[PDB]
């Protein structure tokens, strides 16, 4: 969701992290 290579899109954060 948020950029910050989390889990989504392997390049973004879905929420919290």
């Known amino acids: ?3 910050n290579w ?3 899109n392997d390049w973004s954060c ?3 992290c």
């Open 6 to 8: 989390g889990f989504e």
């Open 1 to 3: 969701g948020r950029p």
């Open 14 to 16: 879905v929420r919290v």
